[PDB]
Structure formats: C-alpha cells, structure tokens
C-alpha cells in the first residue's frame, strides 16, 4: 500500500528514555495544564516513602522533586488533586501521626515548582474539590462529616455545616450538599436534607427534603426523593438550582434499584433505570430539554449492580453517536449503536472482509460487537476500552468481535473513520492505542504476556502501519501516557525491565515524522452521517447536516496544536421525526404521528396525578432536544389540559 520513508532516523534522535530508579506501590501520573508539558509522577512504598517526579518536556525527562515535600509520606487514596485548566493548582495529602489534631496538605499554585505545607483544622474524608469557576476555592469533607471550605487555595479553612453526606460544586461557586440530623448518613438515607449556598457558607437554603441522593449533569440538578411512608423513590429535576422542582416522567424504584445519568449535555440526559429484581440490566430513557419528559430509548441495557459496569459510550468523534451493550433473551451480550441520540438503535455493521465466528448462527450474516468496561471487568483479554476524540472527526477504535454476540476469544482491534457506520479490522490481536495530532497519527502497542521493544504508527488513520523499535532492552509494557486532548506529537511508553525490577519510560516525539504542516489542499470535503447521497435529506441528524474538512488519508502532515475542526451546518426542514411525543401521547404503529393515550397507566398515571401545570398541559409534541430543524412541519393544535383526564376516573370531594 504505502508507508513513510527513512522514518527510523527520524525517530532515533526523538526517542527519549528516562529511568525511574526507586519506584514501588501505587504509581499515579498527572498531567498539569494544557500546553504546559508538566507531568507529575507520585509513587508510594510500604513496609513507607513517597517519591515525586516532574517533567516539563511531556515525559522526555523528569527530575526528582521529593525534596520539595520534605520527603514525607503522601496518602494515595487522595492522589494528586489537580486544579482546573491552566490554573496550575496541585494538592497532595500527607499522612499524619495518629494523634494529630488535623490533616496536612502540600500545595502548589505554580505547577509544582514550589510547594507549601499547610496543617488543616480537620482530617479529610475526601479529595479536595476545586470550584470550576475559581481555582482558589476548595471544599472538603472531614472524617467528622463536616463540610470545610477554603477561599484561598487551601490556606485557611472554615467549617460551613457540621453534618454532610455529599457535597458538590455547581456553576458560579455554588455549593450543593446533603445533610443529616439524627445519626449516620447511612441511617438517615432517604431522610436527608438537600441544601444550597451561593455565598460560600454565609447563608443556606434547604432546597430539598426526604432526600436519598443527588447529582448534576448538563443544566440539570437531579435529586432522588423517597415516597412518604414508603420504601421507594423517584427523580425530581431542577434547572433553577433548587429554587423550583418538578417530578420526572420516570418510574419509581425500590431500594435494590438505582438510577444513573449515563450522559448529560446542555440539551438532555440519558437516564438508566435499574430493573426490579437483580437483573443486571435496565432501560435507558432520553429526556426532553427540561429533563422532565422521558422517551424510552433502550431495553435490557446491561448495567451491573455491584461494581457497576456499563458499556455505555459516547462516541465523541461524531455528533449523535452512542454505542452500548444489551442483554439478549438467550442471555448473551450484543452491542448496539444509535446515530440519532437514542431515537433508534441498531446492530453495528460488520467489516466487509470479516468472517463470522462461532457465536454467529449464519457464517455469512452477523455483526460487530464491542469490548468495553463490561468485557474488561469479566477479565477477557482487553487492554483498552473504546477510544475516540472530538478533534479527530469520525474516528473510533475498539477491541471487538464479529458474530451474534460478544465472544470470549482474544479480540483483534477494529477501527472506523466514519463514526461507526462502517468498520475495518485495524490490527490483529489486542493492542493499547492512542491518537495524536487530531488523528494525524495513530499509535499502537501490542498487548503481550512477554516483553516488547516495538511501537506501531499510522499517518493514514489506520489503513497502513509501520513499525519502530524504540529500545534495545525490551520492557514489560505498563501503559501509555499522552497529553489529554489528542493534540500533541508526544507519546510516553511506560514499562519495566526484566529483573531487581525498575520502571522506565520511553517518550517519542513525532515532530520529524510529519515535518510538513498541513495546508488547505490537504483537507477534503466530507459530509457526516451520509447514507444515500441522492437524498435531499441525506445526513440530516437532529434536524441538520454537517460538512467537514477532514485530513486526507494520503496526505501526511501535522494538523497542529492550534488545529480547528471546520464544519458547516445545513438546516433541514422539520418533519414529524424531529419531534418526540409529549406527556400522555404515544406513537402507535408505523405512523410517526403522536396520538393521545386512551388512558395513562403506571408512572404515567403517577405523574398525571402528581405532576404540575406546565407539563400536564401539552401540545402532544415537543422538538427533540438539540434538534435544530427549521420550517416544514410544526404541529398545529391547541395545548390541552390533561389533569382532568387522569382525575376523570376518581370520585372527588366537594
């Protein structure tokens, strides 16, 4: 096919070895800041000692800064707490003598050039959490279940409430937290009170009662609330930060049951609801843009209750695309993909040249299935979960199998450049994989029981590969590290030599491999979501199309750190398919027409009794959240009031 020439020399001077000498136990790695190059490596020993290393070169060289922490012992439970973005804030938690009045931290605002020791008034139960708004604002939970806040980068701490189960930063330095009264968080479960502070503890407002748990995603604030004189509970939603609430359109659940936010974005959430009775699976619902009304997206979605693992995956390299696992009747697992944000799920098309396996009832006809958290947890030979990056358009890389179900065999690696519509076997056998330069470079390391001296790369998005021996002394591979955001040319291969064992890291700079900077000609026009190009609506997803400029497979050049994914939207005519049925409406049959329910049952009937004025009254149709369509069809009909229809059956008092 095609390759890069004289590459060996180009990677020769760019391969940078660093040996880590003393290392043991927990090894944490933290990137600090974007486009800084700062990496922290924290190690701990036990009968012990903590070693701390720093690199400004993206891992090409480190320097032992343990002398900055006074060679004291860092507790790994709390790891390295890194400030948001380029703040440079770094906080480590030291272990203190048993009798100490309070804990102790080592903090740096300088990207760990200098640290300062600070004795705390308390003992941290949790890692310290930075306010996303202001990186000098931190909150922590004490072992006494106190809520402590620092206005200056952990220098001074104030205890704002004395009983707290859970606490979170919202937007604008807001703090949400749950509290208890009588006794342990555990005991008062369901009886918890939900509070909010917007002043950092000057004043509070209790925005919920009978609270079980809460959580944030997108614009939504979710709270689980227990039913009066009952063992069950249900979701309530707030977009006003607790000021007003509304009951969700979801079913209630018992105590063995749970809710989970699978994904949330400014438009909506995917809510997973556990099935009653230890199924190991649930149903996924997608919400409307209020987070109030829930369409039912997927049945028998696999989510384990203990050590809860779900293969649910945002495919971040193309808009609207998500993959996940479902549990079949034959008790086997199948991967499904949605291109529309959960309006439709379907099996993943299999590679043209792939062959079906034993799991498949027909040798000619089967599909592609993806290994993800679940496979991993069951200890199938799976080095990495699925990878995609938003700056690498359409690209998805995953271990998988081709057949009627996820198979237990040793998986090859598969790739897609179109966002999951079509696939190809990228490499045979399990590999660790990473994306550099927004897809300009793909890198892979073989997964082996025995040591490896070799790395593999592709500049054509996985179509052909080349091989580079980065060391004479082969190592046992322990991981890849590369700058978050997939924009660098720099990749770190982590491992240890055969023993007297020690860790080493070989960091490779591809700057010479692609010497040429990409230019306008190197990009070609690509419509995302194309199915039938003769169709006027081809590629409309959620009301609109996007056309991209993508880097040619053939063209090899660096995209650049400043690279901008450029795309243009086309606004499609609204059709009924752009709407979801509103409360008390459903799509019977083939027709996409939303029609009125004859009567509301189950949680529909629950809501209908217990809902509120806005949602109970309806147009029968709402725009799918995030759906940008213009013109064409707007359903025309008058808002009705459904409260009468539910209460219609009940005898009412005077």
Ligand X SMILES: Cc1cc(=O)oc2c(CN[C@@H](CC(C)C)C(=O)O)c(O)ccc12
Ligand Y SMILES: *[C@@H]1O[C@H](CO)[C@@H](O[C@@H]2O[C@H](CO)[C@@H](O[C@@H]3O[C@H](CO)[C@@H](O)[C@H](O)[C@@H]3O)[C@H](O)[C@H]2NC(C)=O)[C@H](O)[C@H]1NC(C)=O
Ligand Z SMILES: *[C@@H]1O[C@H](CO)[C@@H](O[C@@H]2O[C@H](CO)[C@@H](O[C@@H]3O[C@H](CO[C@H]4O[C@H](CO)[C@@H](O)[C@H](O)[C@@H]4O)[C@@H](O)[C@H](O)[C@@H]3O)[C@H](O)[C@H]2NC(C)=O)[C@H](O)[C@H]1NC(C)=O
Would you tell me how many other CB atoms lie within 10 Å of the CB of residue 628? Answer: 16
Does residue 260 interact with ligand X by CB under 6 A? yes
Does residue 266 interact with ligand Z by CB under 6 A? yes
Interaction residues for ligand X, span 286-345 (CB under 6 A): 305, 308
Q: Which residues contact 183 (CB under 8 A, 6 or more apart)?
A: none
In this chain, which stretch among 101-109, 158-166, 178-186, 214-222 interacts with ligand X, using CB under 6 A? 214-222
Does residue 58 interact with ligand Y by CB under 6 A? yes
Does residue 490 interact with ligand Y by CB under 6 A? yes
Q: Which is nearer to ligand Z, 324 or 401 (CB)?
A: 324
Does residue 316 interact with ligand Z by CB under 6 A? yes
E strand map for 367-437: 367-370, 396-403, 412-416, 424-427, 431-436
Q: Which residues contact 13 (CB under 8 A, 6 or more apart)?
A: 512
**Minimum distance from residue 92 beta carbon to ligand Z (Å):** 27
Does residue 62 interact with ligand Y by CB under 6 A? no
Q: What is the dihedral of CA 487, 490, 496, 497, to 10 degrees?
A: 150
Distance CA 648, CA 652 (A): 9
Does residue 60 interact with ligand Y by CB under 6 A? yes
Q: Which is nearer to ligand X, 212 or 477 (CB)?
A: 212
Distance CA 532, CA 433 (A): 32
Q: What is the dihedral of CA 499, 505, 510, 513, to 10 degrees?
A: -10
Q: Which is nearer to ligand Y, 102 or 560 (CB)?
A: 560
Does residue 390 interact with ligand Z by CB under 6 A? yes
Find the radius of gyration of the CA atoms of the chain: 27
Would you tell me how many other CB atoms lie within 10 Å of the CB of residue 12? Answer: 11
**Minimum distance from residue 232 beta carbon to ligand X (Å):** 11
Q: Which does 488 bind (CB under 5 to 8 A by kind): ligand Z, ligand X, ligand Y, none?
A: ligand Y
**Minimum distance from residue 1 beta carbon to ligand Z (Å):** 31
Q: Which is nearer to ligand Y, 57 or 357 (CB)?
A: 57
Which of 192, 207, 221, 264 binds ligand Z (CB under 6 A)? It is 264
Does residue 10 interact with ligand Y by CB under 6 A? no
DSSP 207-256: EEEEEEEEEEETTEEEEEEEPTTSS-EEEEEESSTTSS-EE-SSPPB-SS
Strands 116-119 and 640-641, by their bridges, are unpaired
- Three-state DSSP at 514 gives coil
In this chain, which stretch among 73-81, 134-142, 287-295, 311-319 interacts with ligand Z, using CB under 6 A? 311-319
In this chain, which stretch among 252-260, 349-357, 412-420, 508-516 interacts with ligand X, using CB under 6 A? 252-260
Does residue 485 interact with ligand X by CB under 6 A? no
Measured distance between the N- and C-terminal CA atoms of the chain, rounded to whole angstroms? 84
Which of 263, 382, 442, 646 binds ligand Z (CB under 6 A)? It is 263
Q: Which is nearer to ligand Z, 10 or 319 (CB)?
A: 319
Question: How many chain residues bind ligand Z (CB under 6 A)?
Answer: 8
- Three-state DSSP at 468 gives strand
Q: What is the dihedral of CA 406, 319, 316, 55, to 10 degrees?
A: 170
Interaction mask 211-250, ligand Z, x per CB under 6 A: ----------------------------------------
Q: What is the dihedral of CA 518, 521, 527, 533, to 10 degrees?
A: -150
Distance CA 28, CA 17 (A): 19
Does residue 265 interact with ligand Z by CB under 6 A? yes
Which of 489, 528, 540, 594 binds ligand Y (CB under 6 A)? It is 489
Distance CA 611, CA 273 (A): 20
Q: Provide the binding-site residues for ligand Z, judged by CB under 6 A.
A: 263-266, 314, 316, 319, 390
Q: Provide the binding-site residues for ligand X, judged by CB under 6 A.
A: 212-215, 222, 224, 258-260, 305, 308
Q: Provide the binding-site residues for ligand Y, judged by CB under 6 A.
A: 37, 56-58, 60, 488-490, 509, 561
């Amino acid at each position: 096919c095609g390759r890069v020439r004289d590459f060996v020399a180009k990677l020769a001077n760019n391969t940078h070895q660093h040996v880590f000498d003393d290392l043991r136990g927990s090894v944490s790695l933290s990137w600090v800041g974007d486009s800084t190059g700062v990496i922290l490596v924290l190690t701990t020993f036990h009968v012990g000692q903590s070693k701390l290393y720093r690199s400004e070169d993206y891992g090409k060289n480190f320097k032992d800064i343990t002398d900055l922490i006074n060679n004291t012992f860092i507790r790994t439970e709390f790891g390295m707490a890194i400030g948001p973005e380029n703040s440079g804030k770094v906080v480590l938690t030291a272990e203190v003598s048993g009798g100490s009045r309070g804990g102790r931290i080592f903090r740096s605002s300088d990207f760990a050039k200098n640290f300062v020791q600070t004795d705390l008034p308390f003992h941290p139960l949790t890692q310290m959490m930075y306010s996303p708004q202001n990186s000098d604002y931190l909150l922590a939970l004490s072992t006494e279940n106190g809520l402590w806040v620092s206005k200056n980068f952990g220098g001074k701490w104030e205890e704002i409430h004395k009983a707290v189960c859970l606490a979170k930063w919202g937007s604008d330095n807001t703090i949400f937290f749950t509290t208890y009264a009588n006794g342990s968080c555990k005991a008062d479960l369901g009886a918890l009170e939900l509070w909010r502070t917007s002043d950092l503890g000057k004043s509070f407002k209790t925005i919920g009662v009978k609270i079980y748990s809460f959580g944030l995603g997108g614009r939504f604030l979710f709270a689980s609330v227990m039913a009066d004189k009952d063992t069950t509970r249900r979701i309530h939603v707030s977009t006003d930060q607790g000021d007003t609430w509304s009951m969700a359109q979801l079913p209630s659940v018992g105590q063995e049951q749970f809710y989970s936010i699978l994904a949330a974005n400014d438009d909506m959430v995917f809510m997973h609801v556990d099935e009653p009775g230890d199924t190991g699976f649930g149903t996924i619902f997608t919400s409307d843009d209020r987070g109030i009304v829930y369409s039912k997206s997927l049945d028998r979605h696999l989510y384990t209750t203990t050590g809860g693992e779900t293969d649910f995956t945002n495919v971040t390299s193309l808009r609207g695309v998500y993959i996940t696992s479902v549990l079949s009747e034959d008790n086997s697992i199948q991967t499904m993909i949605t291109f529309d944000q959960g309006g439709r799920w379907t099996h993943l098309r299999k590679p043209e040249n792939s062959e079906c396996d034993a799991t498949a009832k027909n040798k000619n006809e089967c599909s592609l299935h993806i290994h993800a958290s679940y496979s991993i947890s069951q200890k199938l030979n799976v080095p990495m979960a699925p990878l995609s990056e938003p700056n690498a358009v359409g690209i998805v890389i995953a271990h998988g199998s081709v057949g009627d179900a996820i198979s237990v065999m040793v998986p090859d690696v598969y790739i897609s450049d179109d966002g999951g519509y079509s696939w190809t076997k990228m490499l045979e056998g399990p590999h660790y994989y990473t994306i550099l330069d927004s897809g300009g470079i793909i890198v892979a390391i073989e997964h082996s029981s025995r040591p490896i001296n070799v790395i593999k790369f592709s500049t054509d998005e996985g179509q052909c590969w080349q091989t580079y021996t980065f060391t004479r002394d082969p190592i046992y591979f322990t991981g890849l590290a590369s700058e978050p955001g997939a924009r660098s040319m720099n990749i770190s291969i982590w491992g240890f030599t055969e023993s007297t064992s020690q860790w080493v890291s070989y960091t490779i700079d591809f700057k010479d491999i692609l010497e040429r900077n990409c230019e306008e000609k190197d990009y070609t026009i690509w419509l995302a979501h194309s199915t039938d190009p003769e169709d006027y609506e081809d590629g409309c997803i959620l009301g609109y199309k996007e056309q991209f400029l993508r880097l040619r497979k053939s063209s090899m050049c660096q995209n650049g750190r400043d690279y901008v994914v450029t795309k243009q939207p086309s606004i499609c005519l609204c059709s009924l398919e752009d709407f979801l049925c509103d409360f008390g409406y459903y799509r019977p049959e083939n027709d996409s027409k939303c029609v009125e329910q004859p009567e509301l049952k189950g949680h529909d009937l629950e809501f209908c009794l217990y809902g509120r004025e806005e949602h109970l009254t309806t147009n029968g149709y709402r725009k799918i959240p995030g759906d940008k369509c213009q013109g064409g069809v707007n359903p025309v009909r008058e808002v009705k009031d459904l409260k009468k229809k539910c209460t219609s059956n009940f005898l009412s008092p005077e």
